[model samples]
Target: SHMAGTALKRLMAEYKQLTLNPPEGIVAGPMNEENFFEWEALIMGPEDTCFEFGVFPAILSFPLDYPLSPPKMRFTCEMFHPNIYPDGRVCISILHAPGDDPMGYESSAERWSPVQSVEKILLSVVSMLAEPNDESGANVDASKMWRDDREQFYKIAKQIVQKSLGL
Candidate 1:
């Protein structure tokens, strides 16, 4: 547990935020023992999007030195989105970790910081679903489709949602 003490403190702060201002249609919980550095998350797609009615499954993997570094999150279930890579990695600024960006795509303050919380992350993901950043995309193909072909993007996202639910 000592190894995860740092993470626990971070998680506790994040947990408090979730209780105070929960994101709509999102549910999350610690994956197991409080000391474990994993979390389970369920996200309901924003209404009217191709992902509406979809239940997204994901995990939050915390770093041992959390608060100093940002944790990583991945969708365990298949997802098709411009900001979500084929490998299920979500591309969002808050998750990048607070640091100088050599690529100049994000400001150092725009990246992750200890003050950020899981609730904020989920809220960001929800906003991402509504307004994807196609320029700095995680999935190039999906990004192209999102920009060049809206219909195709919707089709692919719907298919992924169906598959995620075993439908």
Candidate 2:
């Protein structure tokens, strides 16, 4: 009772907080008003970056254990990033560190904290669209392109942005 109840209480607080003072280019909330564990998010690409002017949606699923762990998120749209899986799952250290240090160099500095609000996650997602940690490659191809073929990476990201606009 406590686990899910705590999660529900916190989710409601953040959901209302998000609505009252939402950040620019970020909006998120429970997909079903009756269910706080499942959330849908919209992230607008950060300005002056490859993904600028793009809009992408992602889903956030929280476990019943409340803050004992973190939620898992997956984008519902197309995405190509060093930290985004080919299947659109986000792989940011802030989102899930504790991945046994996938890159071996991944610092423990970014470990998730229940005290951290959902706002931070949304901000991270937007920042991730503009800049990715090539050292942590969720998409090897995109990682290689981001590191080895700068032009191609920007080009491909630009294309995705245009497609997001149906242009």
Candidate 3:
């Protein structure tokens, strides 16, 4: 049943909270009526940044054993950033499973855990888009330009924003 079980319950509660008082620029909705495993999101690019006024679309796929595992997210909208791969997959720390890092880039405390909620994940994604992690970049070209050529990076970002508006 999707009504009261821990996994479904928590997701439903989070859904209610988010939709009732949606985040400033983040909107989330279920992909279908019966399936809670898939979700779609539209996030407004952060203000004062090059991505401002852009609508970034993304998808989150939750596991059936959710609450025991983190959800996987991929942006459907075109994205150019360090934390987001060229393929549009998001690479935030919280998405990583709790345990020792095979790549040794993060500790267990920094990875995903059962305590995290949907709201937290959405908020983290917002922050990630605002300030990328250059050290552990998912897109090497974007990371290099972000660090070495600030002007060009902003130019590219603005171009993406313009493209988002279909300009």
Candidate 4:
């Protein structure tokens, strides 16, 4: 009971805070009245980037343990980025569990901690959109273009953004 209770309390607090002082270009809430563990989020593309003007829809599925572990966010909309998989799962250091990096690509400080909130996660995603880390990309093809062909990468990103906007 304590586990579920703690998770619910944290979720409610984060939801209230978000509603009270919403972040720029991001909106999130429980997917339904019944389940707080699952949330639907929408993130607007960062300014001056290929993702700009796009409204990307995503889902955040939280674990019962919560704060101790990070939620998994997956885009419902098709996303094409080095940091995003073909299935739309995002790959970034901030979302990973805090610990020693076996791969040594990210520092423990950069990984997830209990202090991380929903707003922080969305902001990180926005920043990731503006500047991707190709060194450990989720999408190999996207990463290749991101590193080797800037023009092509931008072109593909713009196309994906347009689709996101239904334009």
Top candidate, metric TM-score: 4
Best-performing candidate as measured by lDDT: 4
Report lDDT per candidate: 0.79, 0.83, 0.83, 0.88
Better of 1 and 3 by TM-score: 3
Summarize candidate 3's per-residue lDDT along 1-167 as a digit string, tens digits.
55236777767877998888888899997889788778999889999778899988899988767788888899987878988889988887788885533335544455888888778889988988888777668899999999999889988898888877778
Alpha-carbon shift of residue 74 in model 3 (angstroms): 0.8
TM-score of each candidate structure, all chains considered together: 0.87, 0.92, 0.89, 0.94
What is the per-residue lDDT of model 2 for residues 1-167, given as tens digits with 9 covering 90 to 100? 87788888888888898999989999899999778899999888999998999888889998887566778999887888899899988988777645544635444556677876788888887887877888778899999998899889999898888877778
**Model 4 CA deviation exceeding 4 Å by range:** 99-106
lDDT of 1 by residue, 44-144 (tens): 88898888888899988888888778778889999878888789888787888645332355455558877777777888898888778776678889889
TM-score for predicted model 3 compared with the true structure? 0.89
lDDT (10s digit) by residue, model 4, range 1-167: 89988999999999999999999899999999899999999999998988899999999999999989999999998888888889989887778895633246435556888888998889889999999988667889989988899888888888888999887
lDDT of 3: 0.83
- Rate residue 49 of model 1 by lDDT: 82
